[PDB]
Amino acid sequence: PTQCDVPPNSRFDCAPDKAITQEQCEARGCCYIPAKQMGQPWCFFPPSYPSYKLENLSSSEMGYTATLTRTTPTFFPKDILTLRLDVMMETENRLHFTIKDPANRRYEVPLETPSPLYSVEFSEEPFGVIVHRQLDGRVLLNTTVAPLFFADQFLQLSTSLPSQYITGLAEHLSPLMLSTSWTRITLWNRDLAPTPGANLYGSHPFYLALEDGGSAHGVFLLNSNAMDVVLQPSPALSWRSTGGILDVYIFLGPEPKSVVQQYLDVVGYPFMPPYWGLGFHLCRWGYSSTAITRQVVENMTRAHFPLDVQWNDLDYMDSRRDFTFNKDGFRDFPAMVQELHQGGRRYMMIVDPAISSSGPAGSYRPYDEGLRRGVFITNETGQPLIGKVWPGSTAFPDFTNPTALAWWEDMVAEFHDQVPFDGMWIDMNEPSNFIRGSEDGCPNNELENPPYVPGVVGGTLQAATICASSHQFLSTHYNLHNLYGLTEAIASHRALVKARGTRPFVISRSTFAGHGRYAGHWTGDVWSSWEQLASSVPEILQFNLLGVPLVGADVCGFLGNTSEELCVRWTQLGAFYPFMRNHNSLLSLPQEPYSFSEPAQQAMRKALTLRYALLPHLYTLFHQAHVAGETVARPLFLEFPKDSSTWTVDHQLLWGEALLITPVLQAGKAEVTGYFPLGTWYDLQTVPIEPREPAIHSEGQWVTLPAPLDTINVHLRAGYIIPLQGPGLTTTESRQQPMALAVALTKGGEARGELFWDDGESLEVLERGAYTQVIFLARNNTIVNELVRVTSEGAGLQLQKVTVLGVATAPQQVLSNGVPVSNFTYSPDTKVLDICVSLLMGEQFLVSWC
Numbered sequence: 001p002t003q004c005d006v007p008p009n010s011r012f013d014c015a016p017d018k019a020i021t022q023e024q025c026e027a028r029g030c031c032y033i034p035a036k037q038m039g040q041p042w043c044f045f046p047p048s049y050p051s052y053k054l055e056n057l058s059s060s061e062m063g064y065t066a067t068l069t070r071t072t073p074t075f076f077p078k079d080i081l082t083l084r085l086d087v088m089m090e091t092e093n094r095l096h097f098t099i100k101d102p103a104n105r106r107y108e109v110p111l112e113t114p115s116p117l118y119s120v121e122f123s124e125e126p127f128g129v130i131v132h133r134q135l136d137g138r139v140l141l142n143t144t145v146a147p148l149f150f151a152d153q154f155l156q157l158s159t160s161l162p163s164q165y166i167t168g169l170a171e172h173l174s175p176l177m178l179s180t181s182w183t184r185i186t187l188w189n190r191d192l193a194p195t196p197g198a199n200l201y202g203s204h205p206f207y208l209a210l211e212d213g214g215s216a217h218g219v220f221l222l223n224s225n226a227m228d229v230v231l232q233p234s235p236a237l238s239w240r241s242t243g244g245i246l247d248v249y250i251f252l253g254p255e256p257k258s259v260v261q262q263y264l265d266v267v268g269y270p271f272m273p274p275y276w277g278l279g280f281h282l283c284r285w286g287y288s289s290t291a292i293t294r295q296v297v298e299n300m301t302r303a304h305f306p307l308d309v310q311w312n313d314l315d316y317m318d319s320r321r322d323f324t325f326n327k328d329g330f331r332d333f334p335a336m337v338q339e340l341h342q343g344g345r346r347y348m349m350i351v352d353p354a355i356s357s358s359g360p361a362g363s364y365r366p367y368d369e370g371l372r373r374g375v376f377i378t379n380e381t382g383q384p385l386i387g388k389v390w391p392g393s394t395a396f397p398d399f400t401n402p403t404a405l406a407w408w409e410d411m412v413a414e415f416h417d418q419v420p421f422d423g424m425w426i427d428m429n430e431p432s433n434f435i436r437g438s439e440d441g442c443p444n445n446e447l448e449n450p451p452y453v454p455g456v457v458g459g460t461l462q463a464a465t466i467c468a469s470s471h472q473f474l475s476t477h478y479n480l481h482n483l484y485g486l487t488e489a490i491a492s493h494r495a496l497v498k499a500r501g502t503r504p505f506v507i508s509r510s511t512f513a514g515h516g517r518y519a520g521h522w523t524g525d526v527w528s529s530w531e532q533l534a535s536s537v538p539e540i541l542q543f544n545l546l547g548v549p550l551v552g553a554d555v556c557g558f559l560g561n562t563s564e565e566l567c568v569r570w571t572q573l574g575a576f577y578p579f580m581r582n583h584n585s586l587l588s589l590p591q592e593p594y595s596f597s598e599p600a601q602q603a604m605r606k607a608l609t610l611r612y613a614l615l616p617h618l619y620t621l622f623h624q625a626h627v628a629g630e631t632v633a634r635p636l637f638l639e640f641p642k643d644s645s646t647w648t649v650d651h652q653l654l655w656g657e658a659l660l661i662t663p664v665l666q667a668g669k670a671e672v673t674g675y676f677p678l679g680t681w682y683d684l685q686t687v688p689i690e691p692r693e694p695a696i697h698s699e700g701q702w703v704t705l706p707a708p709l710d711t712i713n714v715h716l717r718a719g720y721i722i723p724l725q726g727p728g729l730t731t732t733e734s735r736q737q738p739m740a741l742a743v744a745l746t747k748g749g750e751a752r753g754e755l756f757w758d759d760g761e762s763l764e765v766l767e768r769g770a771y772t773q774v775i776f777l778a779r780n781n782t783i784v785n786e787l788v789r790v791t792s793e794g795a796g797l798q799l800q801k802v803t804v805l806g807v808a809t810a811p812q813q814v815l816s817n818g819v820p821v822s823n824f825t826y827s828p829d830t831k832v833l834d835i836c837v838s839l840l841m842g843e844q845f846l847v848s849w850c
């Protein structure tokens with residue numbers, strides 16, 4: 001047929017709900033053409049398939065409103081035949097539209113609200129929204145490409161994509177750039193060890209699409225229901241959600257970093273972590289007493305390994321229950337944590353969401369009080385839904401209930417009164433259930449058995465979690481499931497603020513869009529494998545683009561047994577995770593830095609030492625994330641979008657604009673090949689911290705670098721200045737040391753950098769102005785600071801070393817504030833000028849040479 005002449009790559013599936021025969025396909029009013037070898041749909045929509053018609057388009061002060069009408073039913077039940085379209089032109093960068101049922105309030109995700117670069121026009125029949133980039137006329141969105149479906153439990157909205165390059169749609173084990181070859185991406189939070197093609201712990205319905213020439217846009221669908229996102233190679237995308245409404249934001253960039261910042265303007269800028277949170281964290285399942293746990297710190301200390309935060313897993317609890325500690329191995333738990341604090345370290349422990357429900361009445365306050373106050377998710381007969389997790393039978397708190405929030409704050413404060421822990425590791429908050437749904441199964445209804453089930457592991461919404469039709473304060477679990485973790489992270493953030501009075505530190509397994517405003521994330525139960533080491537790079541980068549910059553993987557891997565070589569390379573790379581924790585499973589061989597051979601220990605110690613030297617810089621990068629929606633770890637394409645060679649690179653990463661990390665990610669290698677964008681890149685090993693080229697002069701090219709077992713390649717971009725600080729086994733110690741600058745000159749002698757400094761943990765620092773901020777500038781053989789703000793926290797900072805890279809000629813003299821310096825060295829082979837000074841970050845200085 002004429003209408004069935006649709007190019008293969010542009011066929012949209014008219015049988016996404018079930019296996020179909022040719023006769024049934026045709027009776028739907030669809031085209032049946034088998035592919036010649038999910039894949040390309042054999043049953044697909046002709047361009048005439050019934051959609052909605054636009055009627056009564058009107059122009060308001062905020063934008064546009066219209067009615068959308070479907071005349072012919074779809075093959076799903078409960079089509080909503082009359083919809084309302086609202087288009088809001090919110091800023092020059094942000095376009096917002098919604099499609100709703102004007103006759104019924106439908107579930108919506110709870111969220112605080114925050115010439116243009118876009119234009120918008122509409123197709124009448126079939127209905128579509130078309131968004132152009134005004135500067136070049138590129139079509140960014142065109143929803144005319146397939147029918148709009150809007151049924152009670154099935155929404156589908158499709159669009160063309162501007163290129164084959166698209167990233168986002170966490171959480172999945174994938175390259176940073178997603179495959180457009182008939183790929184079904186499922187968002188349904190699920191406790192499963194990361195494996196390819198699976199819905200994992202978190203769900204972020206946001207994508208960033210690259211455009212030829214290096215501009216980009218982003219799209220956020222504000223919808224928390226179970227969904228599939230289907231990418232096809234035309235290229236095009238289909239959102240398929242199981243409930244809610246279509247609430248769509250388009251972010252115009254044009255730069256990828258701006259797209260990310262614009263997205264974070266809606267969902268929230270990243271929270272500012274405490275400085276100590278950027279130190280090394282060490283944990284395992286199996287530190288089964290305070291004595292053993294104390295030995296970890298002792299063993300790290302004796303072998304000169306920095307450690308800011310000691311953790312415990314389930315070991316601490318009384319019979320694996322929250323807000324208890326056993327009176328055998330952990331009898332003296334309070335004293336252990338007090339002692340940690342006396343030495344300048346912090347303490348973290350695991351908290352699960354589910355609460356043991358099986359104890360005698362009156363014997364377990366978290367449950368007894370939860371029951372009294374009605375804090376738990378309830379079932380059909382109004383009683384707590386009971387599942388099974390680590391303690392046995394458990395009820396599940398409803399973190400959408402304000403009373404549950406108050407209860408959680410209370411349980412956290414009461415436990416903190418016994419043991420003064422410094423944050424919360426919130427696990428199992430998908431929510432995870434070791435049985436299907438509940439001890440009593442689940443009822444048979446349309447929420448438990450919906451007409452479209454996304455491609456979830458196990459083929460049901462109840463698999464490894466609770467019943468979809470269970471009740472929460474705001475809605476059913478069906479609607480709220482993908483928010484469970486997020487809502488717990490918000491509750492825990494608030495609880496920690498109230499209990500401790502300083503910045504919270506929450507690390508969560510499950511996440512949703514906006515998570516980064518409250519908490520960080522670790523990537524869960526990764527294997528100790530070379531595969532998963534390599535896969536951690538794109539995953540950490542992905543979460544940075546999603547505004548969760550406090551992210552990392554379990555260093556050396558969680559599951560199975562690490563090898564020495566793997567743990568060296570994983571420690572080297574993982575020292576560049578913004579959140580750095582080595583964590584290990586119960587039955588695995590030990591993998592603490594001190595448990596390896598001497599050469600391995602040296603390499604691991606070096607990795608940790610370099611991280612601690614860089615902490616002032618890392619902290620400043622977090623400040624930029626927090627105040628301007630920047631990324632901390634970023635892919636090369638975020639920083640060099642106009643170099644199309646960067647677009648598929650995800651085994652290198654940047655810290656901010658200027659530090660390029662090129663890890664070895666394979667066994668047996670003593671070299672690595674990395675992409676170097678146009679520029680001069682100085683080898684960071686030429687900066688004295690306490691055939692290798694000193695500078696890579698790149699045109700935009702791949703470069704093979706020596707990378708023996710003791711080495712990770714780290715390069716500093718010309719034009720940038722990096723603040724550093726002296727060593728310590730903790731940040732309590734390190735923050736008191738002298739600082740240094742590493743100054744990477746351009747060929748013309750230019751560089752710029754910055755330092756942000758506050759007390760490291762107080763609330764409302766920016767609001768109160770309790771911070772110091774300094775800019776550094778190199779120009780014409782001088783280095784100066786520029787004092788943006790100087791306060792008490794910052795006025796003691798001693799600058800004792802200035803290292804200048806790319807100094808072509810040996811200076812005859814070096815001056816600090818007009819006075820010849822006590823000592824400097826120049827190396828003619830590396831072009832490094834190293835200068836001892838006695839200066840203050842917060843007082844104006846001028847260092848010069850000639």
Ligand SMILES: *[C@@H]1O[C@H](CO)[C@@H](O[C@@H]2O[C@H](CO)[C@@H](O[C@@H]3O[C@H](CO)[C@@H](O)[C@H](O)[C@@H]3O)[C@H](O)[C@H]2NC(C)=O)[C@H](O)[C@H]1NC(C)=O
Nearest residue numbers: 357378379380381382383384385386438439440441442443
């Ligand atoms: C809603 O959740 C409640 C729990 O909060 C469920 O209560 C459970 O109901 C089952 C029977 O439907 C009870 O099983 C019975 O146990 C007794 C011994 O204790 C035994 O003699 C019976 O033969 C039967 O096995 C179960 O004890 C009870 N759970 C608790 C903790 O009391 C209720 O069934 C749930 N409703 C729905 C519709 O799922």
Ligand SMILES: *[C@@H]1O[C@H](CO[C@H]2O[C@H](C)[C@H](O)[C@H](O)[C@H]2O)[C@@H](O[C@@H]2O[C@H](CO)[C@@H](O)[C@H](O)[C@H]2NC(C)=O)[C@H](O)[C@H]1NC(C)=O
Nearest residue numbers: 053054055056057058066067068069070081082083084102
């Ligand atoms: C598109 O809009 C027209 C006109 O709407 C007008 O009347 C409605 C009831 C409101 O008061 C609105 O503000 C007015 O602009 C709709 O056509 C009208 O529908 C009424 C109810 O069915 C009829 O009684 C009326 O005769 C008719 N008016 C005209 C001029 O045709 C039309 O239904 C609407 N289309 C859709 C799909 O909603």
Ligand SMILES: *[C@@H]1O[C@H](CO)[C@@H](O[C@@H]2O[C@H](CO)[C@@H](O)[C@H](O)[C@H]2NC(C)=O)[C@H](O)[C@H]1NC(C)=O
Nearest residue numbers: 047048123125126128130139142143144145146
């Ligand atoms: C948006 O997508 C639609 C559908 O792919 C495009 O509309 C088609 O345009 C061709 C000519 O290019 C016509 O022959 C068809 O009749 C149109 N189809 C439909 C269903 O209307 C449209 O061109 C796209 N718009 C933009 C601006 O790219």
Ligand SMILES: *[C@@H]1O[C@H](CO)[C@@H](O[C@@H]2O[C@H](CO)[C@@H](O)[C@H](O)[C@H]2NC(C)=O)[C@H](O)[C@H]1NC(C)=O
Nearest residue numbers: 291292293294295296297298299590592594595
């Ligand atoms: C801390 O280090 C000590 C010393 O290396 C470890 O103690 C040894 O443990 C092994 C068991 O694996 C014994 O064979 C040795 O005899 C022990 N030596 C001493 C001197 O006690 C200890 O296991 C380490 N603890 C932790 C928690 O890592």
Ligand SMILES: *[C@@H]1O[C@H](CO[C@H]2O[C@H](C)[C@H](O)[C@H](O)[C@H]2O)[C@@H](O)[C@H](O)[C@H]1NC(C)=O
Nearest residue numbers: 527528559560561562585586587588589590
């Ligand atoms: C992780 O290791 C433990 C213990 O392994 C023991 O035997 C092997 C062969 C080595 O020699 C170790 O040094 C020794 O301690 C195993 O019991 C466990 O199965 C293993 N895990 C996996 C996934 O293989």
Ligand SMILES: *[C@@H]1O[C@H](CO)[C@@H](O)[C@H](O)[C@H]1NC(C)=O
Nearest residue numbers: 749779780781782848849850
């Ligand atoms: C660099 O400084 C010297 C004075 O110390 C001056 O002669 C020269 O013009 C300066 N260069 C520029 C570009 O300002």
Ligand SMILES: OC[C@H]1O[C@@H](O)[C@H](O)[C@@H](O)[C@@H]1O
Nearest residue numbers: 015018019020021039041042
């Ligand atoms: O995707 C291809 C599949 O489509 C289904 O709807 C058909 O029933 C199958 O025969 C076919 O293999």
Ligand SMILES: OC[C@H]1O[C@H](O)[C@H](O)[C@@H](O)[C@@H]1O
Nearest residue numbers: 285313314350427524525585
């Ligand atoms: O608490 C026991 C285990 O629970 C989950 O599997 C966590 O992902 C893991 O890190 C932890 O060790």
